[PDB]
Ligand binder design. Structure first.
Ligand SMILES: CC(=O)N[C@H]1[C@H](O[C@@H]2[C@H](O)[C@@H](O)[C@H](O[C@H]3[C@H](O)[C@@H](O)[C@H](O)O[C@@H]3CO)O[C@@H]2CO)O[C@H](CO)[C@H](O)[C@@H]1O[C@@H]1O[C@H](CO)[C@H](O)[C@H](O)[C@H]1O
Ligand SMILES: CC(=O)N[C@H]1[C@H]([C@H](O)[C@H](O)CO)O[C@@](O)(C(=O)O)C[C@@H]1O
Ligand SMILES: CC(=O)N[C@H]1[C@H]([C@H](O)[C@H](O)CO)O[C@@](O)(C(=O)O)C[C@@H]1O
Length: 421
């Protein structure tokens, strides 16, 4: 039982339809594909930055009663300018002669619109704030699912969860376009772009289980993610965020075995008046993940990869390490001269999943040199200083949010902050 009417995927050297219908795909000259993952497609605010799918005539939506759904991932750069404030722009267009469906965006909004041949319309909308300290949505990959049941509602899901639903049983015949245009249409911000991936159309209303499964399956959950949702990489400098203490950042008081890594504050804020106000993300000692036991030639960090962690202090690389030999649960982490690590413990097991199954935010399980767990890396308040530690206390704990959850943040043009140093 195959409900896919379009499944747009990058294979070999081409974007192609992997559905049974084999619709034709025309790509403009200014479409960018991410080298690390060519399924990630960047569309600028330019006439030539477009992808047009010409649908088989027989699968064009033209009905009073047929249910259908769409799914895709999107990464939306922060809105930077007041010209975006009240400017709805189409991004995925299947409207013709004022009937059909489309996906549009606006300041802090993702919008679905349906319209019948008598111009009766209904919309469902996801809204997100740009005035939030740490956003789950701004410039981070979002999984969108929209379902349409002609007997009752359109529904919009975000990361597998229902956000909005609205009645559409009053709409009559909807006759959509023969082509789907992926293109910024009516956007007045000349600098705007989006990233998109994994666009699908389905000839049914997807149920909650199907949507959750699709989210889980397209998540690439064997691969660790950076803060934006891209693949976490080796050899790439990252700023660290601890989710349980998000107003602080990592620093090293002094390099060497008598120093320690710790959380210090304030992070401070980035703002453009009445457009955004967020915590500064480009703060503290950068981490670089290094290959240790990975067999893959590529630069991708996978679940259970055994690695080293380097830390950058005054533009020079040091090794994250601890002495595991004294009794005591928490092992304070230091930044060591790489040539002088000696018999200190440094091997880290990178985790994208809680157990074989359940996906968690990044964790780093430090090993001793006999291969026993020293514990997940987090932090411990030693009176007035929160020092970074590895601690098996974390390993024994529920599935609540703990101090061992981290995000890895690289500099990205959709965020727009300037690195201070
Ligand atoms: C709440 C707390 O401190 N939890 C610790 C845990 O501490 C245990 C025990 O819970 C605690 O009551 C006791 O604290 C007493 C102290 O030892 C005495 O010297 C003092 O006179 O009075 C204190 C209160 O009676 O200490 C115990 C440990 O010696 O110990 C575990 C390790 O087994 C953890 O350290 C736990 O704190 C967690 O540590 C985590 C990292 O491992 C992480 O940082 C968590 O933030 C933190 O909750
Ligand atoms: C629910 C709770 O907070 N438990 C605390 C316990 C209690 O103090 C017990 O009574 C210990 O005997 O102490 C500790 C520990 O000993 O590892 C961890 C934790 O902070
Ligand atoms: C104060 C607070 O909200 N959370 C603290 C948690 C504990 O889990 C709870 O205090 C009790 O278990 O301890 C720690 C950690 O896990 O790294 C630091 C964190 O700040």
């Amino acid at each position: 039982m195959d409900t896919s009417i379009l499944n747009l995927r990058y294979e070999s050297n081409h974007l192609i339809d992997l559905s049974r219908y084999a619709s034709k795909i025309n790509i403009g000259s200014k479409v960018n594909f991410d080298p690390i993952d060519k399924n990630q497609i960047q569309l600028f605010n330019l006439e030539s930055s477009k992808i047009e799918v010409i649908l088989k005539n027989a699968i064009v939506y033209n009905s009073m009663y047929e249910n259908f759904s769409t799914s895709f991932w999107i990464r939306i750069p922060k809105y930077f300018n007041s010209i975006s404030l009240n400017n709805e722009y189409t991004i995925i267009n299947c409207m013709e002669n004022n009937s059909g469906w489309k996906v549009s965006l606006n300041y802090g909004e993702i919008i679905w619109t349906l319209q019948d041949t008598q111009e009766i319309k209904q919309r469902v909308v996801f809204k997100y704030s740009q005035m939030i300290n740490i956003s789950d949505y701004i410039n981070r990959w979002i999984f969108v699912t929209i379902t349409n049941n002609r007997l009752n509602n359109s529904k919009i899901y975000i990361n597998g969860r229902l956000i909005d639903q609205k009645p559409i049983s009053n709409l009559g015949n909807i006759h959509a376009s023969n082509n789907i245009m992926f293109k910024l249409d009516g956007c007045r911000d000349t600098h705007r772009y989006i990233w998109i991936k994994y666009f699908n159309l389905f000839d049914k209303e997807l149920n909650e289980k199907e949507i959750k499964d699709l989210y889980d399956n397209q998540s690439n959950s064997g691969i660790l993610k950076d803060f934006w949702g891209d693949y976490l990489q080796y050899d790439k400098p990252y700023y660290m965020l601890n989710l349980v203490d998000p107003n602080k950042y990592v620093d090293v008081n002094n390099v060497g075995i008598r120093g320690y890594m710790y959380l210090k504050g304030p992070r401070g804020s980035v703002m453009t008046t009445n457009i955004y106000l967020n915590s500064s993300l480009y703060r503290g000692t950068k981490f670089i993940i290094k290959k240790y036991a990975s067999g893959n030639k590529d630069n991708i960090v996978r679940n259970n990869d055994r690695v080293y962690i380097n830390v950058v202090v005054k533009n020079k690389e040091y090794r994250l390490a601890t002495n595991a030999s004294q009794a005591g649960v928490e092992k304070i982490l230091s930044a060591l001269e790489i040539p002088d690590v000696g018999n200190l413990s440094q091997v880290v097991v990178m985790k994208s999943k809680n157990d074989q199954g359940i996906t968690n935010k990044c964790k780093m399980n430090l090993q001793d040199n006999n291969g026993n767990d020293i514990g997940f890396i987090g932090f411990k308040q030693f009176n007035n200083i929160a020092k970074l530690v590895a601690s098996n206390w974390y390993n024994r704990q529920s599935s609540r949010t703990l101090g061992c959850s981290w995000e890895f943040i690289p500099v990205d043009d959709g965020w727009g902050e300037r690195p201070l140093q």
